[PDB]
Amino acid sequence: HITDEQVLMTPEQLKAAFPLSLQQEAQIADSRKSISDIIAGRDPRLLVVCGPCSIHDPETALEYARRFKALAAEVSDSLYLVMRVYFEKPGWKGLINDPHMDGSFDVEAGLQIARKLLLELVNMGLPLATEALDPNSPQYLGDLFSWSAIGARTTESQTHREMASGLSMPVGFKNGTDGSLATAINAMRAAAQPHRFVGINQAGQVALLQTQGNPDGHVILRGGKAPNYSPADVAQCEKEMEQAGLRPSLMVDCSHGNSNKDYRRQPAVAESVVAQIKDGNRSIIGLMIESNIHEGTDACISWEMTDALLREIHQDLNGQ
Amino acid sequence: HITDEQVLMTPEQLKAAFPLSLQQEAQIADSRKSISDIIAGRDPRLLVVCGPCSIHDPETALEYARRFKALAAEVSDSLYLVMRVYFEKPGWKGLINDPHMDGSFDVEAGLQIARKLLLELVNMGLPLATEALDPNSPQYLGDLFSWSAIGARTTESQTHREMASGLSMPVGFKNGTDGSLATAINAMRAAAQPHRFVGINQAGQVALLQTQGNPDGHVILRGGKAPNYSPADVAQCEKEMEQAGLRPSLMVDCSHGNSNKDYRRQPAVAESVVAQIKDGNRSIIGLMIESNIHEGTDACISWEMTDALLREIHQDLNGQ
Numbered sequence: 001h002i003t004d005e006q007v008l009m010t011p012e013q014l015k016a017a018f019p020l021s022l023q024q025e026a027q028i029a030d031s032r033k034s035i036s037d038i039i040a041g042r043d044p045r046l047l048v049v050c051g052p053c054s055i056h057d058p059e060t061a062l063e064y065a066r067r068f069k070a071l072a073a074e075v076s077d078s079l080y081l082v083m084r085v086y087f088e089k090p091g092w093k094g095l096i097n098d099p100h101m102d103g104s105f106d107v108e109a110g111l112q113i114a115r116k117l118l119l120e121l122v123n124m125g126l127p128l129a130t131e132a133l134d135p136n137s138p139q140y141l142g143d144l145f146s147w148s149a150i151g152a153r154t155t156e157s158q159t160h161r162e163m164a165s166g167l168s169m170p171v172g173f174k175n176g177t178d179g180s181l182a183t184a185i186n187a188m189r190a191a192a193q194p195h196r197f198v199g200i201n202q203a204g205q206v207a208l209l210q211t212q213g214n215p216d217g218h219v220i221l222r223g224g225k226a227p228n229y230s231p232a233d234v235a236q237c238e239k240e241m242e243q244a245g246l247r248p249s250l251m252v253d254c255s256h257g258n259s260n261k262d263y264r265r266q267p268a269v270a271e272s273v274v275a276q277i278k279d280g281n282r283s284i285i286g287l288m289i290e291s292n293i294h295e296g297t298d299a300c301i302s303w304e305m306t307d308a309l310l311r312e313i314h315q316d317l318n319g320q
Numbered sequence: 321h322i323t324d325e326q327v328l329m330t331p332e333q334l335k336a337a338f339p340l341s342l343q344q345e346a347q348i349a350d351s352r353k354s355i356s357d358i359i360a361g362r363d364p365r366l367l368v369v370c371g372p373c374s375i376h377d378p379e380t381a382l383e384y385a386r387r388f389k390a391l392a393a394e395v396s397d398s399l400y401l402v403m404r405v406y407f408e409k410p411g412w413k414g415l416i417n418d419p420h421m422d423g424s425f426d427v428e429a430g431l432q433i434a435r436k437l438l439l440e441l442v443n444m445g446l447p448l449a450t451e452a453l454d455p456n457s458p459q460y461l462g463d464l465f466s467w468s469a470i471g472a473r474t475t476e477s478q479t480h481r482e483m484a485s486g487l488s489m490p491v492g493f494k495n496g497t498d499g500s501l502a503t504a505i506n507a508m509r510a511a512a513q514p515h516r517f518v519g520i521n522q523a524g525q526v527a528l529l530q531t532q533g534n535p536d537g538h539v540i541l542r543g544g545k546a547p548n549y550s551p552a553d554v555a556q557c558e559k560e561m562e563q564a565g566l567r568p569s570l571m572v573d574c575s576h577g578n579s580n581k582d583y584r585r586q587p588a589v590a591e592s593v594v595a596q597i598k599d600g601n602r603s604i605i606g607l608m609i610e611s612n613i614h615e616g617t618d619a620c621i622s623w624e625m626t627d628a629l630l631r632e633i634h635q636d637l638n639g640q
Contacts, residue, residue, distance in 0.1 A: 023639070070396035073363050074354055123638050124397060125364070 009108050010204030011139045018115040020143060024122050031082075031127035031146040035170045036216040038080060039249050039285050045077075046277075046317065047251065047286025049129045049147060050306065051084035053298035056095050058117040061085065064293060064303070065121050071307060072126075075314040082147050084129040084288075085121065087114055090151060096137075111140055118144040135163045136200045145169055149220060152177040155187045163199070164191035166211035172220040172251050179224025181237055185244045188217040218249040218285055223257020229269050231276050238283045248283035255290045256298075263299040266290075267309045274316050287313075329428050330524035331459045338435040340463060344442050351402075351447035351466040355490045356536040358400060359569050359605055365397075366597075366637065367571065367606025369449045369467065370626065371404035373618035376415050378437045381405065384613060384623070385441050391627060392446075395634040402467055404449040404608075405441065407434055410471060431460055438464040455483045456520050465489055469540060472497040475507045483519070484511035486531035492540040492571050499544025501557055505564045508537040538569040538605055543577020549589050551596055558603045568603035575610045576618075583619040586610075587629045594636050607633075 009017075020028075037043040051068070055061050065083060072081035088094045092101055096110035118141060121128055127146040132138055133154065142148075150173045154160045164171050164187070171191060173184040193213045201207040219237060221228050228237070229252045238248040252258065252273045259265035266289060273284055289309070295302040301309075329337075340348075357363040371388070375381050385403060392401035408414040412421055416430035438461060441448060447466035452458055453474065462468075470493045474480045484491050484507070491511065493504040513533045521527040539557060541548050548557070549572050558568040572578070572593050579585035590607055597604060609629070615622040621629070 066394070066397035070365070073365055074350075077362075125640065 008204060009111065011200075011202045012204075014111055014115060014140055015143070015202075018112065018119055020119070020122075024119075025143075027125065028122065028127075028144065028146055032169050032216075034080060035082065035127070035147050039170055039216055039218045041247070041249070041282075041285075043080075044320065045080045046284075046313075047082065047147075048079045048289065048310070048313075049082045049084055049149075049251070049286060050289035050291055050310075051129070052086065052292045053290045053300035054086045054089050054094060055117075056087075056092075058113065058120075060293065061117060062120065065124055065126055067303060067307075069124055069126055071310060075310055078314050078317045078320075079310065080127075081310075082127045082129045083121065084131075084290075085118060085145075086131055088133055090133050090153070115141060115144070132160070132163065132167075135159050138163065138167060139200055139202065142167065142169070147172070150174060150187060152222070155183050158190075159197065161187045161190045162195040162197040162211065164217075165193060165195040165213045166197075166199070166209060167214055170216040170218075171214055172218050174220040174222045174253075175224060175228070177224055179226065179228060181219065181240050184219045185240060185246065188219065188246065189244060191217055218251055220251050220253055220288065221258070222253045222255075223259075227258040227260075227269075229254075229258045229272055231279075231281075234276065234281065234283065241283075249285050250283050251286040251288060252284060253288040255288055259299075261299050263295055263301045263305075266301050267305065267312075270309055270313060274313055277317065277320070328524060329431065330522065331520075332522045332524075334431055334435060334460055335463070335522075338432065338439055340439070340442070344439075345463075347445060348442065348447075348464065348466055352489050352536075354400060355402070355447070355467050359490055359536055359538050361567070361569070361602075361605075363400075364640065365400045366604075366633075367402065367467075368399045368609065368630070368633075369402045369404055369469075369571070369606060370609040370611055370630070371449070372406070372612045373610045373620040374406045374409050374414065375437075376407075376412075378433065378440075380613065381437060382440065385444055385446055387623060387627075389444055389446055391630060395630055398634050398637045398640075399630065400447075400606075401630075402447045402449045403441065404451075404610075405438060405465075406451055408453055410453050410474070435461060435464070452480070452483065452487075455479050458483065458487060459520055459522065462487065462489070467492070469494060470507060470511075472542070475503050478510075479517065481507045481510045482515040482517040482531065484537075485513060485515040485533045486517075486519070486529060487534055490536040490538075491534055492538050494540040494542045494573075495544060495548070497544055499546065499548060501539065501560050504539045505560060505566065508539060509564060509566065511537055538571055540571045540573055540608065541578070542573045542575075543579075547578040547580075547589075549574075549578045549592055551599075551601075554596065554601065554603065561603075569605050570603055571606040571608060572604060573608040575608055579619075581619050583615055583621045583625075586621050587625065587632075590629055590633060594633055597637065597640070 038047045087096045099110040129147040130145045131149045173187045176183045191214045195211045199209045241248045254266040254269040290300040291306040292300040358367045407416045419430040449467040450465045451469040493507045496503045511534045515531045519529045561568045574586040574589040610620040611626040612620040
């Protein structure tokens, strides 16, 4: 049986408690537009989604964000840095479903703390990236992010392509865990179309939502059974995107698939992408980097390696 | 008559005895580029030249540098911290012309001790600032600094505008002791132009030096008979810079002129500058702060006040 039934704080109440200013909303809109122009090929800068493997402390996230902002101010001519703020990953639930780390599962406090942290990060003038797992979480925090990613077992799910068609931000779809590009391509094509699904409204009520569709989409080359960052795999992805009637636009993830979840191989992947760009590649739009304060249960690279790698990429991409 | 005639150690010999590594030279080049981008308006961070009133002990300088580096790592998102290492000021001569404090005037030992200290400071990853009084001293230590200032009775001197056109670092020109902005503006305009003067070569020989000119210039609002940090004085400086065909780019010195050489008024000047930035000021590029370990024959602020003031500026500049 069900014993207690206590209403959760609605997205309206949450956004009223922790509100965006008009300036911050304009900044988020500008960053969304810039990322979408990068994806579309109208902006020469390379998109770089980089950040912690997962966020489980606001103070660690703020220190990483200060270092990240200081670095972005120095590589802003060639690279466009976006910080991924990943709370819940697909034990402990990750600061939103359990902010007290004691199984209490205080979801109201978790939502408030996450929104406060994201508001502080946006106030620093930092575009944010996320990976939507809960289809209803973009109703609570989606107004704070400038870029979203759709996952492996999440891409083929139709609920998530509908939610992606409902999102307001540029969006990258990851290929299949078996390396299937067709799933990502089809999710990208379907997210560009209007959709009608069952979600929640801003009053926290179950509702029927209608979506125009998301025209700002791209593929995330994540690697499956084998890495797919080589020029041959990139050309095959371009071929499949052209056959599907889409403009070749892909982001290479230096993380889990293309490095076998090993930290030492991420800079090599980034350097291969840079070399491909030097040889005239036109489809590679961005990179994805998992990087925490220290090296080392995901294998995220150290901050010293992140600084060195982004400096090398910035220094090598000058001619273009 | 002249009795003895002993050759001084040349810049080549001094740099060979205390050399920069390639990595440290690249670090100095990166910091010079970052400071110049801040001055030009391409970098959003605020330049902050801060440090001891004058250096007369390597150990004190190293302790201050450790604290300054620790603090810079925490305010790096909004502020760019540059440590002024001032040896000789315009009795005792200041550790270069008299490192033994006994009138022996061992200039070789002074140059070597200064270079060793500056090399240790650079090794800590700290950009250094200086004020060139001797026109030939930049030939011995100039490779170690990222920013230079040109002084009051030094600005109108043509030898120093030539030497500034010869410097490799970003440069700030102080207004006249009578508050004259025209002197600083004209020195800045002239230092941007090539020049041919008499100086010394790396072999310590008198030579004719030709200089491309220094395009990284800005005005230092130092205050004259009255302080000139108020929004009205800032607007007047912007007006005189625009009339001279220059982009308005100025640094506000919280020290001698704008505080009447009183330590208690520096944070108030800094807070006025922050308030001006909040009201939409676009010309103010940085601050200058004289701060030693303890309070109190220049009136430099204590390190506790320096920490508090930089933290307040960092916390107030967040929105931008």
